[PDB]
Design a protein around this ligand. Structure first.
Ligand SMILES: Nc1ncnc2c1ncn2[C@@H]1O[C@H](COP(=O)(O)OP(=O)(O)O)[C@@H](O)[C@H]1O
Ligand SMILES: Nc1ncnc2c1ncn2[C@@H]1O[C@H](COP(=O)(O)OP(=O)(O)O)[C@@H](O)[C@H]1O
Ligand SMILES: [Mg+2]
Ligand SMILES: [Mg+2]
Lengths: 183, 742, 183
């Protein structure tokens, strides 16, 4: 079999198969609901637009981000995002694909616990693992030492790694990110 | 025997001569083999066994003494010159060597070895291959027909006609020892039984592009040539198909110090054709170029001038025109100039940009590409992420690896396209019914400086041997069920598969190397440490290396069917990587030359492919081997072994160590070892009666009464209904008591 | 054959074949252990860095000297030091090489006995000898009389020798040495 690498991130979900040179699916992590009434009868509009499709109907939807700063705040929306990623984007059954997930440092333990519970129960993934953003970023850079500054849309954190050994007491986190810049 | 004409002597000796040679002095008690220093063993007479000290007088007159624990009996006269090694009363490693030696002394070229066939190339013309023998041989079954290739060929033909299944022949031997002419005469035999000229005309293109000079052989072949000879519905020759497998790419870029590269480059540099040199702007000095100068510059292996001329003539008389030949020549020249590329790290940035561009300019002109576009692609590969394209950064090491991978891939595609063109030209419009396969592969080469390529070759040979062991076991079980003598059902595969599982399976040496080359900071010491941590003591085949006679280096040693083989880690990591560049392939597809055809394709359910970076030579090899085994296993196999008699051209003389090495690499010792653990000696009750009933002068009851009086233990024999099986010790005891009886 | 002259000392192991002008291998006598966990997988870090290697990884290791004041307090660490000296720095198997060891005057007898036992058992050296660090120093000076003051890193001592006859009742030992100066 083959492993599946999904990165929820913040503001952009990116997923693909392991061993690939770039994620196959990249799309905003947005859940939209219609705020108007709807007069035409027979079209049968769906009650929730998820993913990049919500961008197309941006003008008649109330876009909501399931996560504020790394932490998931709307679990149902996150389940919808994961279902869309697994079915409508990769078109694969997670019943036979181990899943690698990415999670930022210094976060509530309940977050990881609920993530793993959802993955194991709702989708019945055979196995799964959770990793830190900084370690992966260092992996991709072809380096074994150095301090990595990861600044996404949710949170900006610095992690120093020396000879493959982390320095937990020196890890720094700051909530300033792209969303605050947009605001 | 009169049917075999004047070739009868070589094919077999007359029964009268056999009887005449049977009687000669031999004392089984003290005529046993003795270890030797110059050779593994010598024929010598032991004066007496004075405790742990013995005095053996050999043919050379030496009186050396040897330890008593490594003495072993010798063949009696009545079983000398035996046709089949399976029937030898005492199965021993040098006994087969000496029997073959004395058989070639009498010029017995062909010998049975149970499931194997031993054929030593004679150095003089013989009448055995006269077509009259071929014409008059038809109508004889393998059992009565004395040893020769025609026997197994006819047996396989009969199987394909009657059992209605595909058959395959596997030939093993060193190139240049007569393999080519052996294949020629085999195909001639098939034609007689019903395109030999076409095959002969097309070979030069193949060995010209597939052979290179090594220490052992000056014309060593690497790729796994394979030929399927098809037949018609009515069992008549229809046409032939040719395929290639397991072509090595590492030889293109990396060469050992005392070895050359493929003959193509050296042949191209021949000065007898100045037009190609001047129109390709090729530097006439091989030293200047980087790819070739690393290895040995030149040897007196074969004169490249006339060989190149003959290859060009063969291409000219082939179906395609000269523009295509110019295309291959210019593409080979382009492959030659990729080594002149140079790159310098940017002063203010990590990315490295080129310094010189004249070589790049001329190369791009050659392929009809743009130098600027190629340099941008090499320096800044484009990659598709999601729905948008982004540029990737590359350092000097990554771009060098990418250039090497591109050269290797383009060469491989050229060779594959050439093979397809040759197959299409050879193809005739006859229907393709069941075929007969012919497989030629490199042997279990052994050096004192074994490396990654040797590891791959040895692994392929070990897999082939394991297949052979499984096939022989199946045949043995079939014979046992036919005879109703069925015991020891344990299969003979896992014993050799234990070493195989330490190579291809996850956490094996190959998998560990594949993972390690991915790690950004891997080094040879770390790789060795990981191997030692994961295999020392934990596995039954990985062990420490051994230092003898001041060998240059040894890192680890594996136990194979051919013995202990040590490998050198150094250099493996750098050459394992094969990272291809996608944008360069796209540019090639956009080219204005024929090259786009070879690179035409390269890299609702959502299957995932493999990343360019995640490309290693080791994996492809494995994959190729698998796609070969999934095919070769579909046909009934047959085995042919070719053994060189001596290093020198002088006929008759032999070098025992060379024969020992050939036997060890051919797996004959493995066959005899597998046979001896069971009951290799099987005799009919009629022969046993007429030869041994005089022992107790006076058929189930008679045989039981006779054996009960010989103090034969129950477990030393198997009592059957058609044949009776004896152990070697039983035969020796019977011989001794016959000698004392008379 | 040849003899190995190992001088454990304290804080600096120096060794080399007998008859050489100068010692062949000199390196600090420290054992380093990683005090962090390690995030990067697949590197396969060793659990103990011994000798000069530990000097290059000071920032992610805790260093312990196996010798406090002449005597050996951590026998496993000293065994590791000896193994590294024999198999890496010199790359010579001790199976066929006698060894000469040195130690300071007035040391516990258990130290010497255990050193001899370890050397005969673990490494199986054909033979070994033990000497005082002062008499060898006197030899090296081309003298036969006088007093020798051997101020090493662990212990300092004065040993008077006249005409090759040592005077045990006048040997003086003081525990002040380079380590105390560093502290
Ligand atoms: N070219 C650019 N210039 C400036 N900001 C950018 C650019 N591209 C992306 N961004 C910002 O980066 C954010 C995306 O961050 P992302 O990498 O998805 O974080 P995470 O990995 O945590 O999801 C967006 O909100 C956007 O504002
Ligand atoms: N030039 C110098 N100046 C100051 N201190 C020194 C100098 N040379 C060596 N040392 C000290 O000597 C110590 C080494 O002592 P050493 O002779 O190795 O003792 P031992 O033989 O017992 O190992 C080191 O700790 C170092 O601080
Ligand atoms: Mg992120
Ligand atoms: Mg000292």
């Amino acid at each position: 079999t083959t492993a599946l690498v999904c990165d929820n991130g913040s503001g952009l979900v990116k997923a693909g198969f392991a061993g690939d040179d770039a994620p196959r699916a990249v799309f905003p992590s947005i859940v939209g609901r219609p705020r108007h009434q709807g007069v035409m009868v027979g079209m049968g509009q769906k009650d929730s637009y998820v993913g990049d499709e919500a961008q197309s109907k941006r003008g008649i939807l109330t876009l909501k981000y399931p996560i504020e700063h790394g932490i998931i705040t709307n679990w149902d929306d996150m389940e919808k995002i994961w279902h869309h990623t697994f079915y409508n984007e990769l078109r694969v059954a997670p019943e036979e694909h181990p899943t690698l997930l990415t999670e930022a440092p210094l976060n509530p333990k309940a977050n990881r616990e609920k993530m793993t519970q959802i993955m194991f129960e709702t989708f019945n993934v055979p196995a799964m693992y959770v990793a830190i953003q900084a370690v992966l970023s260092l992996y991709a850079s072809g380096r074994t030492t150095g301090i990595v500054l990861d600044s996404g849309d949710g949170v900006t954190h610095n992690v120093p790694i020396y000879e493959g050994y982390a320095l937990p007491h020196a890890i720094m986190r700051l909530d300033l990110a792209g969303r605050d810049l947009t605001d | 025997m009169a049917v075999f004409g004047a070739a009868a002597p070589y094919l077999r000796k007359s029964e009268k001569e056999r009887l005449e040679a049977q009687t000669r002095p031999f004392d089984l008690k003290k005529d046993v083999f003795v270890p030797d220093d110059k050779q593994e063993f010598v024929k010598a007479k032991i004066v007496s066994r004075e405790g742990g000290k013995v005095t053996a007088e050999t043919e050379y007159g030496k009186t050396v003494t040897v330890k008593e624990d490594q003495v072993m009996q010798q063949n009696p006269p009545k079983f000398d010159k035996i046709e089949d090694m399976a029937m030898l009363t005492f199965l021993h490693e040098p006994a087969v060597l000496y029997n073959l030696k004395d058989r070639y002394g009498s010029w017995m070229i062909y010998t049975y070895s149970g499931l194997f066939c031993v054929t030593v190339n004679p150095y003089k013309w013989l009448p055995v291959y006269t077509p009259e023998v071929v014409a008059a041989y038809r109508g004889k079954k393998r059992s009565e027909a004395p040893p020769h290739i025609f026997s197994i060929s006819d047996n396989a033909y009969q199987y394909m006609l009657t059992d209605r299944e595909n058959q395959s022949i596997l030939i093993t031997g060193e190139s240049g020892a007569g393999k080519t002419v052996n294949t020629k005469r085999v195909i001639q035999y098939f034609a007689v039984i019903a395109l030999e000229d076409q095959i002969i005309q097309a070979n030069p293109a193949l060995e010209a592009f597939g052979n290179a000079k090594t220490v052992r052989n000056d014309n060593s072949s690497r790729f796994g040539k394979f030929i399927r000879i098809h037949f018609g519905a009515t069992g008549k020759l229809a046409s032939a198909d040719i395929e290639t497998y397991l072509l090595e790419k590492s030889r293109v870029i990396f060469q050992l110090k005392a070895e050359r590269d493929y003959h193509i480059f050296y042949q191209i540099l021949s000065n007898k054709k100045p037009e190609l040199l001047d129109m390709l702007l090729i530097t006439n000095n091989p030293y200047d170029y980087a790819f070739i100068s690393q290895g040995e510059t030149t040897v007196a292996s074969i004169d490249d001038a006339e060989e190149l001329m003959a290859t060009d003539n063969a291409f000219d008389v082939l179906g395609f025109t000269s523009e295509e030949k110019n295309s291959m020549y210019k593409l080979t020249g382009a492959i030659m100039h990729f080594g002149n590329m140079k790159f310098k790290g940017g002063g203010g940035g990590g990315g490295a940009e080129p310094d010189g561009t004249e070589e790049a300019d001329k190369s791009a002109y050659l392929m009809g590409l743009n130098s600027a576009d190629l340099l941008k692609g090499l320096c800044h590969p484009r990659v598709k992420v999601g729905n948008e394209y982004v540029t990737k950064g590359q350092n000097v090491q990554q771009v060098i690896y990418a250039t090497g991978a591109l050269a290797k891939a383009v060469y491989e595609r050229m060779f594959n396209w050439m093979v397809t063109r040759i197959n299409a030209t050879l193809e005739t419009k006859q229907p393709r019914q069941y075929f007969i396969g012919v497989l030629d592969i490199a042997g279990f080469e052994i050096f004192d400086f074994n490396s990654f390529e040797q590891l791959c070759i040895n692994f392929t040979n070990e897999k082939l041997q394991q297949f052979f062991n499984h096939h022989m076991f199946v045949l043995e079980q079939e014979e046992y069920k036919k005879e109703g003598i069925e015991w020891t059902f344990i299969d003979f595969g896992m014993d050799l598969q234990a070493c195989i599982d330490l190579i291809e399976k996850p956490m094996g040496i190959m998998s560990i190397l594949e993972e390690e080359c991915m790690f950004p900071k891997a080094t040879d010491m770390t790789f060795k440490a990981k191997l030692f941590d994961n295999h020392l003591g934990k596995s039954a085949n990985f062990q420490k290396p051994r230092n003898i006679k001041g060998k240059p280096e040894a890192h680890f040693s594996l136990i194979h069917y051919a013995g202990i083989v040590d490998y050198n880690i150094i250099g493996w990591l750098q050459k394992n990587k094969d990272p291809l560049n996608e944008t360069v392939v796209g540019l090639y597809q956009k080219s204005s030359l024929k090259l786009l055809s070879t690179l035409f394709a390269n890299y609702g359910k959502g299957k995932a492919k493999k990343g360019s970076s995640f490309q290693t030579v080791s994996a492809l090899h494995r994959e190729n081997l698998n796609k070969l085994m999934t095919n070769l296993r579909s046909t009934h196999p047959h085995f042919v072994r070719c053994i060189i008699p001596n290093e020198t051209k002088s006929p008759g003389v032999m070098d025992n160590p060379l024969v020992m090495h050939q036997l060890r690499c051919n797996g004959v010792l493995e066959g005899i070892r597998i046979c001896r653990k069971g009951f290799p000696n099987r005799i009919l009750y009629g022969d046993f009666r007429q030869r041994y009933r005089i022992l107790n002068p006076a058929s189930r009851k008679g045989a039981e009464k006779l054996l009960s009086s010989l103090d034969i233990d129950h477990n030393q024999y198997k009592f059957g209904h058609t044949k009776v099986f004896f152990k070697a010790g039983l035969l020796g005891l019977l011989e001794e008591m016959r000698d004392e009886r008379l």
